[PDB]
Write a protein that binds this DNA or RNA. Structure first.
Ligand SMILES: [Mg+2]
Ligand SMILES: [Mg+2]
Length: 1208
RNA sequence: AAUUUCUACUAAGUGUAGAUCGCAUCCAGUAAAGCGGCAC
């Protein structure tokens, strides 16, 4: 059997199929006349309204708990906070005190005051009505329809967690609000006497309050007062100042500190206000009104930009030791902008970490580099002083930063000038915004220039309780920035609006004035649920009974004079493990049966269940009781065909239940007069809809949609309960959003150009009209039907363990390698159990089969035309969205290609772990699309079907492969998920497949001395006359950071030629030996002399050495690419194989499915696969029961050992 | 340029080929990675 075979019927999975519901006959007229719809439509309107009222009571609630709270954890907390640290994980004691501050807040919500009636049915039933007429009325409407608020309900209970999320109130109460209060205490202590006694308390004490005193709000025990919004407003008014209910405009503390510019030493810190807590879709008038309002030259966002300009202009005035830059991407970027390279800061910091941790004897090891890396990441931030500590003299870090920041503000001001007419009161919109390209680009330009300023500027927060900070700097900075933060919302909303499809998918749920509408199908509650399913020939229908006529479907003849619909009776026995004991210990059954006490005692004590009070006979007695009770229960034994296993072969009660559950459900069809119900439709006693997708069209002649097959199979004789119909069906109405007269149309009888350049037919002429987006021009009913797949699994085991066991015992196991490439969206390499390539090719082109005809689509050319489009459109939003969606389409094609390969080779899949990576600019499928791809792959593999197989066949629609576990998280895409193994890409592309040689030397020229050392660290350097080549023979031991190489000693030869970047005002090509001959001649070095390393070091000037190294580096540069030309991105290796000939990639370009990789893209997919072979190799070394514990994570050192020894 | 819906189409003439429970994240490979259904 194929390894694949053993993976069927493993676990249940549930899916919902969607269809269009086409109203038949007079149904729509009746629906309108009886006005059934409007009930469900206004609810849809007021939904948003009621939500606001729920937020109202939520906010009164939050302010009942918050008025009532005294933080106990706090006071230790304040003293520790002002303890000024002193670290050594003494602060660790405190970081656990923090969490308990949020813990105390969460529990105070939950703990008391009728929190419980919050996200359950009783909140809009009674609670909202008793809290605060035009609003009570809207809430009343929703009753028995509490469904509407479930997604809302989940979004709002995250409010009260200890989650340390920006969602949490507690995080807000303690994490942001409290720290500011503390930070302000230390400002208040330092800046006390600046206040005039009359000036100080007298205006503030009286006009802001007349209660309390100003001093109070800078005492630690006063914080709890400031948890609620009033105390927050009171606090912020003390800092900011007040209106005064008149002209008075009483001054705040910050103004006074400002007015102490009279000393003009100033830079005396100002207080930071406390965070209060707890767009434009609709119209162009709306979208424009917001842009004008938030971004004009006297808006507050523009005010905060001028202040930040003033602040940073005085950057020199502040203490570089007390100004921090958050650690993360901002460090790479600012490194680039300050010094001129990405990794500089990281590099200097590695130079300093080594000296401390790097033992002289010690040789750098992968772990060492991993741990040092964990340390860097862990560092929260860097002061400007520290950054200047890396600053080479003749560069000022603060000043270079000043010129960069100021530059960015100047770029905002120039972009304002270019957008100036848009902010005229006089301005009006000539064209619709989607129509109006020129305007949209003006808006995007400005938004981008401010967003980028914001996003860059945001870096100067060390995201820490940093011990010493320039509070004078961060007072001004935090005041101004917080407004600037406002841009991100505006930006997103405006972009979502432009980016929108011209049509809308908004819709509303239909109950037809019935809270319990369409709860179930199979169940005979049809008088209650009032929906059912009809069949006629090949067509299926949804039939909805009017309340006054529920039984109308009951009494219908099986008329055979001419024609009948088939009528649905669905039988489901739900949850036998709860139900069988519920029914059969019923008082009525108890009457029916004089059940033995032996049975009752077994149940009550549960000696049937597992749990070591279980008795097998007791279990069997229970079963037999149930079995026999089943014979004598009409409702069930006239519904289902029970065929029970012998009682003895049942291991546990659970074994018995699966059979009840399995046989528990039956579906079959009744017979009902077509003419009779047809008339029921006419009279409006019954409403009918055809359940439809294009595959039900009389002109559909192609292979159907997968979901179409699922739906039909529901009612096919061959389907023995593998896919089942479930309740929870919903009907929606999707109001039309396009007007038919306004659609783009290709008129009948005129040729339409075909767009696929690989389609050999150039035009199409149809005799009817084709309309863009036609389906959105009509009101549309849609029907979502839930199904159950593999509800009663027979094969239970751990999927990961079973994959390992089968791989352990397989003689020629096959692996599919997938890699993302530079010249190829995706590239695939199939390999046997020994590393021989069986298949290699690009997936740039997706080839489709219809009939016997194959037509391909080159998705890489598509992306290329769209990238040119993005260039022509100056990178506007919509092209960006078009590219994202194209890619998401492409990956739905690829999923199918991978499935065929898995089925074809019974192969395991090898994929990049995207939790270990380097971003590569060259590759076209970015991380975020690839992650989506990997999720989709896993999802398919949960149940994998080939549509063209006969459904009952293994791998067909009734026996899908389940070779993957359910997706949990992206973080969870690591190690192995069933047939999928996640591999790190380290050292899979730039490595000789033939030898496993990898360049581990550093050839950058550094110093004349270093170059000599380099040259000297070589064993030999000799020109070989016979083979006309230079031979560099080396030991990796003599060079640093080569621990991973297994074959230490490699001989390098000049042979072949290489493509060099060779930038000139950037490509040229270079031969290798010619360069070695040229350069040596150039300097008077005769090279026919053995071991010229002593000789070479005799040279006196950089020029020899600078160019010797550049020459060397190129030779070790295996991967070569012009980038104008698809034709070559080749791989050539400076090292001979055992047989003595060097690997070139171009010698494999010609062949089909050649033994070694054909280009560098292939090499990468090839080597990703070999790492899985390595993993398989570890399985083959372990005992069956240890397999689950074996480690798949190959280490650069294991990898190179494997790559270099397995080649032979 | 037709769709349950999406993407690419026109595929031989009202359609073709994949894919397709729902929402949120869609740009930072140093922040986040989860919330639903379903099932237990
Ligand atoms: Mg089809
Ligand atoms: Mg389209």
């Amino acid at each position: 059997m194929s390894k694949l075979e053993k993976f069927t019927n493993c676990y249940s999975l549930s899916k919902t199929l969607r269809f269009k519901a086409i109203p038949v006959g007079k149904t729509q007229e009746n629906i309108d006349n009886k006005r059934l719809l409007v009930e469900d439509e206004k609810r849809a309107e007021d939904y948003k309204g009621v939500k606001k009222l729920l937020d109202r009571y939520y906010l009164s609630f939050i302010n009942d708990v918050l008025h009532s709270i005294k933080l106990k954890n706090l006071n230790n907390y304040i003293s520790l906070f002002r303890k000024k640290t002193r670290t050594e994980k003494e602060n660790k004691e405190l970081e656990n005190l923090e969490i308990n501050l949020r813990k105390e807040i969460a529990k105070a919500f939950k703990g008391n005051e009728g929190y419980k009636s919050l996200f359950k049915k009783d909140i809009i039933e009674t609670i909202l009505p008793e809290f605060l007429k035009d609003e009570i009325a809207l809430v009343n409407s929703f009753n028995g329809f509490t469904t509407a608020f479930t997604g809302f309900f989940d979004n709002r209970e995250n409010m009260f967690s200890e989650e340390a999320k920006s969602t949490s109130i507690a995080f807000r109460c303690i994490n942001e609000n409290l720290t500011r209060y503390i930070s302000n205490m230390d400002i208040f202590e330092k800046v006390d006497a600046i206040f005039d006694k009359h000036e100080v308390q007298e205006i503030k004490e009286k006009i802001l309050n007349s209660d309390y005193d100003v001093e109070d709000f800078f005492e630690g025990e006063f914080f709890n007062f400031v948890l609620t919004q009033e105390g927050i407003d009171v606090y912020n008014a003390i800092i900011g100042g007040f209106v005064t209910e008149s002209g008075e405009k009483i001054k705040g503390l910050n103004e006074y500190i400002n007015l102490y510019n009279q000393k003009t030493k100033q830079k005396l810190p100002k207080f930071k206000p406390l965070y209060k807590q707890v767009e434009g879709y609709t119209s162009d008038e709306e979208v424009l009104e917001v842009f004008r309002n938030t971004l004009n030259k006297n808006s507050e966002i523009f005010s905060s930009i001028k202040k930040l300009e003033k602040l940073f202009k005085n950057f020199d005035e502040y203490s570089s030791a007390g100004i921090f830059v958050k650690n993360g991407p901002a460090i790479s970027t600012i490194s680039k902008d300050i010094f001129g390279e990405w990794n500089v800061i990281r590099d200097k910091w590695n130079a300093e970490y080594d000296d401390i941790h790097l033992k002289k004897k010690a040789v750098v090891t992968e772990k060492y580099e991993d741990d040092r890396r964990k340390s860097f990441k862990k560092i929260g931030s860097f002061s400007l002083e520290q950054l200047q500590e890396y600053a080479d003299a003749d560069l000022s870090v603060v000043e270079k930063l000043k010129e960069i920041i100021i530059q960015k503000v100047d770029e905002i001001y120039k972009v304002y000038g270019s957008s100036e007419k848009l902010f005229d009161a006089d301005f009006v919109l000539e064209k619709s915004l989607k129509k109006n390209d020129a305007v949209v680009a003006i808006m995007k330009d400005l938004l981008d220039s401010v967003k980028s300023f914001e996003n860059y500027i945001k870096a100067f927060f060390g995201e820490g309780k940093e011990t010493n900070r320039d509070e004078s700097f961060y007072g001004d900075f935090v005041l101004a920035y917080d407004i600037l933060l406002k841009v991100d919302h505006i930006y997103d909303a405006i972009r979502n609006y432009v980016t929108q499809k011209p049509y809308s998918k908004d819709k509303f749920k239909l109950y037809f004035q019935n809270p319990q509408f369409m709860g179930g199908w199979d169940k005979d509650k049809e008088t209650d649920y009032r929906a059912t399913i009809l069949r006629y020939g090949s067509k299926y229908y949804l039939a909805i009974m009017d309340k006054k006529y529920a039984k109308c479907l009951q009494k219908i003849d099986k008329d055979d004079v001419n024609g009948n619909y088939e009528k649905i009776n669905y039988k489901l026995l739900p949850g036998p493990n709860k139900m069988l004991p519920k029914v059969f210990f019923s008082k009525k059954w108890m009457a029916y049966y004089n059940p033995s006490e032996d049975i009752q005692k077994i149940y009550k004590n549960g000696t049937f269940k597992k749990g070591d009070m279980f008795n097998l006979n007791d279990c069997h007695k229970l079963i037999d009781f149930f079995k026999d009770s089943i014979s004598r229960y009409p409702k069930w034994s006239n519904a289902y065909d029970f065929n029970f296993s012998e009682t003895e072969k049942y291991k546990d009660i659970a074994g018995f239940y699966r059979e009840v559950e399995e046989q528990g459900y039956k579906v079959s069809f009744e017979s009902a007069s077509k003419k009779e119900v047809d008339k029921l439709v006419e009279e409006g006693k019954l409403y009918m809809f055809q359940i439809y997708n294009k595959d039900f069209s009389d002109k559909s002649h192609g292979t159907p949609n997968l979901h179409t097959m699922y739906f039909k199979l529901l009612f096919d004789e061959n389907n023995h309960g593998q896919i089942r119909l479930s309740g929870g069906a919903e009907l929606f109405m999707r109001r039309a959003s396009l007007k038919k007269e306004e659609l783009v149309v290709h008129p009948a009888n005129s040729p339409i150009a075909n767009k696929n350049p690989d389609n050999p037919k150039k035009t199409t002429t149809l005799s009817y009209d084709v309309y863009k987006d036609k389906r959105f021009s009509e009101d549309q009913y849609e029907l979502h039907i839930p199904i159950a797949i593999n509800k009663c699994p027979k094969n239970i085991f751990k999927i990961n363990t079973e994959v390992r066991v089968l791989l352990k015992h397989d003689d020629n196991p096959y692996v599919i390698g997938i890699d993302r490439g530079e010249r190829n969206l995706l590239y695939i390499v199939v390999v046997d159990g020994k590393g021989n390539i069986v298949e290699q090719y690009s997936l740039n082109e997706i080839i489709n089969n219809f009939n016997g005809i194959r037509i391909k689509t080159d998705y890489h050319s598509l992306l290329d035309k769209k990238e040119k489009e993005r260039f022509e459109a100056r990178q506007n939003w919509t092209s960006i969205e078009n590219i994202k969606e194209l890619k998401a389409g492409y990956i739905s094609q690829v999923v199918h290609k991978i499935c065929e390969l898995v089925e074809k080779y019974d192969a395991v899949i090898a994929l990049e772990d995207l939790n270990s990576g380097f971003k590569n600019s060259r590759v076209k499928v970015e991380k975020q699309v690839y992650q989506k791809f990997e999720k989709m792959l896993i999802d398919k593999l949960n149940y994998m079907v080939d549509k063209k197989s006969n459904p009952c066949a293994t791998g067909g629609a009734l026996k899908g492969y389940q070779i993957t576990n359910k997706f949990e998280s992206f973080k969870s895409m690591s190690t192995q998920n069933g047939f999928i193994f996640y591999i790190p890409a380290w050292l899979t592309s730039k490595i000789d497949p033939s030898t496993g040689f990898v360049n581990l030397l550093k050839t950058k020229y550094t110093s004349i001395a270093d170059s000599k050392k380099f040259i000297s660290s070589f064993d030999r350097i000799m020109y070989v006359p016979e083979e006309d080549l230079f031979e560099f023979a080396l030991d990796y031991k003599n060079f640093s950071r080569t621990d991973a190489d297994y074959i230490k000693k490699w001989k390098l030869y000049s042979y072949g030629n290489r493509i060099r970047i060779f930038r000139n005002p950037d490509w040229e090509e270079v031969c290798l030996t010619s360069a070695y001959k040229e350069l040596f001649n150039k300097y008077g070095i005769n090279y026919q002399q053995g071991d010229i390393r002593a000789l070479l070091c005799e040279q006196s000037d950089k020029a020899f050495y600078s160019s010797f190294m550049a020459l060397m580096s190129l030779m070790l540069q295996m991967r070569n690419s012009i980038t104008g030309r698809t034709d070559v991105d080749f791989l050539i290796s400076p090292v001979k194989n055992s047989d003595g000939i060097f690997y070139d990639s171009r010698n494999y370009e010609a062949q089909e499915n050649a033994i070694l990789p054909k280009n560098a893209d292939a090499n990468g997919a090839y080597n990703i696969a070999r790492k899985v072979l390595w993993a398989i190799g570890q399985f083959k070394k372990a005992e069956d029961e240890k397999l689950d514990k074996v480690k798949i994570a190959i280490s650069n050192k294991e990898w190179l050992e494997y790559a270099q020894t397995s080649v032979k």
